[model samples]
Every structure is written in structure tokens, then in C-alpha cells.
Target: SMEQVAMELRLTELTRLLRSVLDQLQDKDPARIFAQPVSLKEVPDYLDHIKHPMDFATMRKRLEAQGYKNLHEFEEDFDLIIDNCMKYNARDTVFYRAAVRLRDQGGVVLRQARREVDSIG
Candidate 1:
């Protein structure tokens, strides 16, 4: 129906606008740690799961041990590492590449987190 299609279009536009606001707010934060709101009551155990092509088991274990409880926390930690790599290494360096890979994986986790919320709602 045309009404349903119009409603969906409005919802999509609203989502884009909300994302823009969130992005702007995140950029203004000095700590650079920003997490989107999710409807999930409990943080899923798999939220802390880290997947990488390179060997990052030790680092992942250390993070989990240090009480990194959620995907948002892990994302912030990885963001710090990536920022450091950008500051200290070349874009083509292995360090930078690894950081990017981990960051991309973090994005995947975030998407899953959103899906959980969407399903609940």
C-alpha cells in the first residue's frame, strides 16, 4: 500500500537523522567512547567475542579478564588502539591493518547488538 510505503520512507529518514545526531555527539566526546542505545536488557555473552584473521587470542583474553563486559567496551578499547596506530604508524603498516580488521569486526558485533534490540521491539 502507498501508506505503508510512505510510513517506511519516513522511518528510514528518521533513522538517518538520528544517526547523524548520534555521530555528531560522539565526535564531540573527548574520550571518543560512544555506544548506541539498545533495547536488550542483558548484555549477551557473545558481545565480548572477538574475531580476527590475525592471532589476537592473548589480547582478547586479557581484555575479557580485565572485565570488558560488553561490545561497547570492546569497541572503545579497539578504537583506542586504532587511534594510536593512526598516530604512530603508516596506513599501509601491518599494525594499522590489524587494527582496522579488529575495528571492522567490532562493527559486526555492534550490528548484531542492534538486531537483538530490533527483534525485541
Candidate 2:
């Protein structure tokens, strides 16, 4: 019983951590084709938005402004590229791509934040 209880506790904690991470990653931009500002507080909100339908134009414009010209371009020619990449598969593909993009974006954010911190120091 102790082992079972421990396992359940571990799973719950993992799920919570994942959900939090997903949320943070989502806000950075779900489309994964553009650069975007990322903050520690916005990640959860970003992930929450991807749980449903999105306005393509708004998403595209934001991404384009950030120097990404072909957000979702993968959908035009491939049968399931976009879906597989961002919509289908339990939102896993979307999460995966977004997470990778966030790494770069997050790095930028961290770099800038570090400068701010150093300035104060």
C-alpha cells in the first residue's frame, strides 16, 4: 500500500509539473514558427490557449511581426504535417515543437533578465 500510494503521489506531482510547464510554453506561442517574448508567468496561459481552436490570422500576424513569415505553412502541402505538428496527437506535437522553440526564446528572455539583474547588482 505504501508503494502504491507513493506511485500515485509521484504521478500527481509529475502531472502538475507538466501542466505548469505546458502552460508556460503555450503562452510563448503555440504556432512554433515565430519568435516571441517569453516570461515565467505566461507559460501556463499560453498552453491553455492551445487546448482549443485559435484565430489563424491573429496568430499569424503576431508570428510574422516577429520575423516568421510562414506560420502554419506546413499545413498547405502536407496531409498531416500541421495537424501532426500542432493539433493532432493529443497536442503532443504542438507541445514538443513549442517547447523547443521556447528554449531559444527562453534563452533570450533569460539573457535579458540577467542583464537587468546585473544592472541592479
Candidate 3:
């Protein structure tokens, strides 16, 4: 329990530091690609605008239809979009970081939605 608590506290501190860095970077260039300021409040709407062919709905449907036998199978397809995003402006670390943030926020929103849907069903 102590180790887990320490890990969580460390993670929280690291997340705060990362956010501070991201804010500084965003201040330097507001027009950076996919580098728009993101907050937890905006994650759901942000996800709506970043639609790729391999979105949560499509992935979930595929799983329901037995197209992906397991989570790894689904991730294999999902990684294609992630890999493409990684290729863009690789030289710009800020752009890459922002892209990752966007992707992570999208995932959080999708997972939340999935939990809600499952609970309702």
C-alpha cells in the first residue's frame, strides 16, 4: 500500500510538471498543429472533432461482431492511426507532445463513454 501510494503521488507530481511544460509550450505558439489547449472539461467535444476511421464506436462494434478476438487485436488496428500521427512533424517535439495529449484525452473520453454505456445496458 505504501509503495502504491508513493507511486500515485509521484505520478501526480509528474503530471503537474508536464502540464506546466505544455502550457509554456502552448503560450509560445498557439497555432501548433493539434496543439490546442486541452482540459478535462473539453475532452468529450475534442474527441468528437478528431474522428478517424478507427474511432471507439467502430472499434467497439468490431469487437461486438467478433472481428477482434481480444484487446490486443483491437489495438493492432488502433495503432495504425497512432503510428500515422507519430510520423507527422517528428522533428517538432512540442507538436508530438501535443498530439499525444490529444490522443490520450480522446482515449479517456472513449473509455468513460464505454463505461457509461455498459452500465446502462
Candidate 4:
């Protein structure tokens, strides 16, 4: 029915918006350090600091799977990514600063997405 069609359309639009946001986030991470999961060997005790890990690859996986129920879920993952960085790295380090930049820019993207979403539904 029209209701199911509307739901599918909304889901598709929201998912595409999330993907665009993720793409912008990836572009901000020039070094691509946050591109995937952190290796314990390389960054030992990383898991000790970050209780929940989130990264670009994981976001993409969920985006592809339609695993995200709403825009807020994508927002949480984005916030989680930055929080994990802030927890493990110091303020002066490149990664930490990157997270700051990413977080700020993420806000910009998030706001833009919200506007687009409002227009969508």
C-alpha cells in the first residue's frame, strides 16, 4: 500500500543521507586512521578505553544492510567514533585534533541532513 511505499521511500532516503554523511566524515580523516577497527597489537589496551567501538567500515556495513532504524542511530555511531578517539588520545595529538575537527564538521553535516530529512518527510 501507500503506507508501506512511503516507509520504504523514507528508509531509502535516510540511508542515502547517512551514507553521504559517512563519506564526508571519511574525507575529513585524511590519514584514514578511523577507517576500520583498531588492532590490539598496534594500539594495545585500546579496547580498555573504548567500551563501544565504531568506525567507517562498520557504519558502511550497517548502511548497506539497512541495519540502521533511524537517523539518530547514525548520529550515535558518529558521536561514538569521536568519543572513542577523545578517550584514548590526548588533546595535542593529531588523532585527537582530528576527532575534534571531525566532530565539529559532523555537526555541520548532521544539521544539513536534518534539514534535508525534514524536507523529505
Candidate 5:
């Protein structure tokens, strides 16, 4: 399904971004730590099992322990999805919706990080 494919793509992009950011930041960034890349397929699986919001936060922190150098990678992945969706036909509504949601959230996440950095230094 287009939706599933879109989701998977987003997840793959997210994992890749996380990994790249982590690789660049461990030696220079404030948070000098490392975490492994989360499997893209694990998103749905984790969602299915978790019942608490805090669990999500915990999961997030675990991933972030890898350290994100910045959010540009995230935005890039989101834009990739949006670009693909915009080119797709209506038959791929699932992909379109997924792209829209991911794109919106990606922007928010990246912008917030940008603000944090700007405020700090």
C-alpha cells in the first residue's frame, strides 16, 4: 500500500538522519553520547505496544542519546516525502496524507531545534 510505503520511507529517512546527526555530533556537541539507529519498521511495532505517553518520551530520549547535530536532515527527509507525494496521483492518497503529516511535524521539530540553538548561542 502507498500509505505503508510512505510510512516506511519516512521511517527510513528518519533513521538515516538520526544516524548521520549522531555521527557528526558525538565529538563536538554538548550531548556527547551515542545510540544505535532505530529500525524503521519498529515505529509501528513500538506504537502498538506502548500505552503511556512517557514511554514515547523515553523512547525518544533513547534515540536522541545518539545526538542530533541539527534538524536539517529531518526537514530534508520530510521534503523528500512531500515532493514524492506531490508528484503522485490520487490513487496514492495514503502516501499523500502520510507525507503531509510528516512534513508538517518535521517542520515543527526542525524549527523548534533551530530556535533552541539560536537562543543558546
Candidate 6:
């Protein structure tokens, strides 16, 4: 309500921050593991397990569309990406373990962004 330009600035920073996490995960994920959707053939039952799927590519699209009305919305998908992994993939598996690590990274970034958003408020 105050100013679109200011709001856009926040959105821009948040999206850039989101991409940083994506890059972090991309580097840590060994290959293109979490870069896209869970492969139906690769993970057979992933569709059956996760009701809400999330991945870096989809998140990038949503961000470009300005889908995140608030920081919390981004947090939802951020957590979903990791939470979906742990739910569908077994805990001992590499995918599950990688999600665990990424979750922590996302958590730190989210908290920092939250602080920033609140500052603007």
C-alpha cells in the first residue's frame, strides 16, 4: 500500500536470496538431484507420497511470477522442498540426507530474511 517500488525491492532481494539457496543446494546435491521435479520413473512412488511437491526450477518460476505475497509463502515452499524429500526418500538415503543439510541452510537464510521483512514493516 505504501509504495510498489519499495515492495519490489524487497521482492527482488528475497528472490535473489532464494536463488542463493538454490545455488547452494545445487552445489551440494551432487548432481541435478533437486534441480527439478522428482522423476516418476526414478522415484516410482514420490507422487504417491508428497501431496505438495517443490523443486528449485518450479520455485524459480513462481518467484519470477511474483507468487510469494509474503516471506512466509516462500518459506512454505522452501520447507516443502526439504520436507518432501525426507518424507518420500528414506532417511538414510543420500537425497534425504542432502535435504537435511539444505533445510538447515534454508532455515538460516529464512530467519535472516524474516528479520529484514520485519524491519521494513
Worst lDDT 10-window in candidate 2? 70-79
Cα lDDT listed for each candidate = 0.45, 0.40, 0.46, 0.85, 0.43, 0.76
Tell me which of candidates 1 and 6 scores higher on lDDT.
6
Give one digit per residue, the lDDT tens place, for model 4 in 1-121.
Answer: 9999988888887888878878987898888878998788897888788889988999899999888878888889988889998988899999899899888877887898878877876
Pick by TM-score: 2 or 5, better one = 5
Residue 2 of model 5: what lDDT?
98
Number of clashes in every candidate structure? 0, 7, 0, 0, 0, 0
Q: Write the per-residue lDDT of candidate 1 for residues 1-121, one digit (tens) a residue.
A: 9998876665555444334433433344333322322112643432233222112233344443444433355445546545654544478876567556656655655566556435643
lDDT by residue (3-106, candidate 6, tens digit) is: 98887887887677656655655565565567898877887777778989988889889978868777778778878888888988798898898898877766
Q: Estimate each model's TM-score.
A: 0.36, 0.31, 0.32, 0.89, 0.35, 0.76
Candidate 3 has its poorest 10 consecutive residues by lDDT at 17-26
Cα displacement (Å) at residue 67, model 2:
35
Who wins the lDDT comparison? 4
Q: What lDDT tens digits, residue by residue, belong to model 3 across residues 28-76? A: 3344443323333845564454444233344445544545433345445
Predicted model with the maximum TM-score? 4
Question: How much does candidate 4 score in TM-score?
Answer: 0.89
Q: Whole-model lDDT, candidate 3? A: 0.46
Any residue pairs clashing in model 3, and if so which? none
Quick one: ranking by lDDT, best first?
Answer: 4, 6, 3, 1, 5, 2
Kindly report which residue stretches of model 4 are placed more than 4 angstroms away from their true locations once superposed.
none
Candidate 6 residue spans exceeding 4 A from truth: 1-31
**How close to the true structure is residue 13 of candidate 2, measured as C-alpha lDDT?**
49
Residue lDDT tens for model 2, 29-85: 656443333332745455443443333343344333432222123123121222323
**RMSD of each candidate relative to the true structure:** 16.0, 16.9, 15.2, 1.6, 16.7, 2.9
